[PDB]
Subunit: 116 residues, 4 copies
């Protein structure tokens, strides 16, 4: 699994379930091209976004729709979404875990990068 996203809720102490995630790749034109999307599971995780063959060198953006998450719990949050932008695989293929820790007015994001 070359790309995995994990989302946690810091108000409830729980995984953040059914959060929409969109992944984009920067194209040769410098536009953001849609690459993959999905929703987190009951464990807060999103697996199966891509394969090693399709996940080439490039600049990628992971967009986490935090606003819809908090609104469905009755909270009006600060941010419109959380965005993570990074260069991937530029020294060969790697495995990436992108984690986000969500509060209404704050978020933290961490990347764990491992060499398979």
């Amino acid at each position: 699994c070359p790309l995995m996203v994990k989302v946690l809720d810091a108000v409830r102490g729980s995984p953040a379930i059914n959060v929409a995630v969109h992944v984009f790749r920067k194209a040769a034109d410098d536009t953001w091209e849609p690459f993959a999307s999905g929703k987190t599971s009951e464990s807060g995780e999103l697996h199966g976004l891509t394969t090693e063959e399709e996940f080439v060198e490039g600049i990628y953006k992971v967009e986490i729709d935090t606003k819809s998450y908090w609104k469905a719990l009755g909270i009006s949050p600060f941010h419109e979404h959380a965005e993570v932008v990074f260069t991937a695989n530029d020294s060969g293929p790697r495995r990436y875990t992108i984690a986000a820790l969500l509060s209404p007015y704050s978020y933290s994001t961490m990347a764990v990068v491992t060499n398979p």
Copy 2:
């Protein structure tokens, strides 16, 4: 001053000095128009970005060039930049402090919204 940005370095326990910050406002196009920019001071802060008159309701993006900051220190970082996207609403008088705590593979951002 309705909008202030503060950037901190979690590796060195210091303000993050001379970090470039770009602020964008969402246009009718759905495109991001330049709005304000500057470099953080010795205290890690950026003041003077805008005025009460010009800072109307809308969606704003604050982009922090974190990759250039780490490269100056000789540290290879994960993120291309840190982005904070939010709506400004007139709900009484509002001042916005956007803070970012930087590490090479992680960042935290917090918004403090207060009322004079």
Copy 3:
């Protein structure tokens, strides 16, 4: 002022006001002696804890009563309190800012150490 404490609420996007803070210094016993205390102001800050003369090298503990803060807001929190334990060293003149960002099931703490 060699030591300042700042506490922020990530649920409400505000300073955390009237939070009790206790500071301890490590004794020869290996025991924690009361050193200073106070309640955070409307800005979430606590100033005036000590003086350059009394703040000698040592190991210090800063205890923030986060559980009482959340209970006042009607939120059931995870932690009994937040603790920050550190050594102070004379390595030139040092000022310490200890910041805590509070959520019900998470907190972040940062130290900014600067030199006048």
Copy 4:
């Protein structure tokens, strides 16, 4: 697994390996009694600290020896250790995951609490 600890390194983007963890339980005397200890694995995780039968209601402290971790990498960090203090199982047995995200001058901690 009623209690699991996960430690990540925000400077290197990796699990924090071979970090010492000590767990204490507050005794009837109000002293901290040793409860369990171990070292994180190559995945940054520490499993097998306790069993459901032994993990009774109480106040627990998880102490993560961050200082030794950073010193072995050549960094002189701010904190002596990271401490997490919490009431456990007071409404029946729960499963607890305690995560810590480490930088030299900052750390974040999160708890995920699930009902088996």
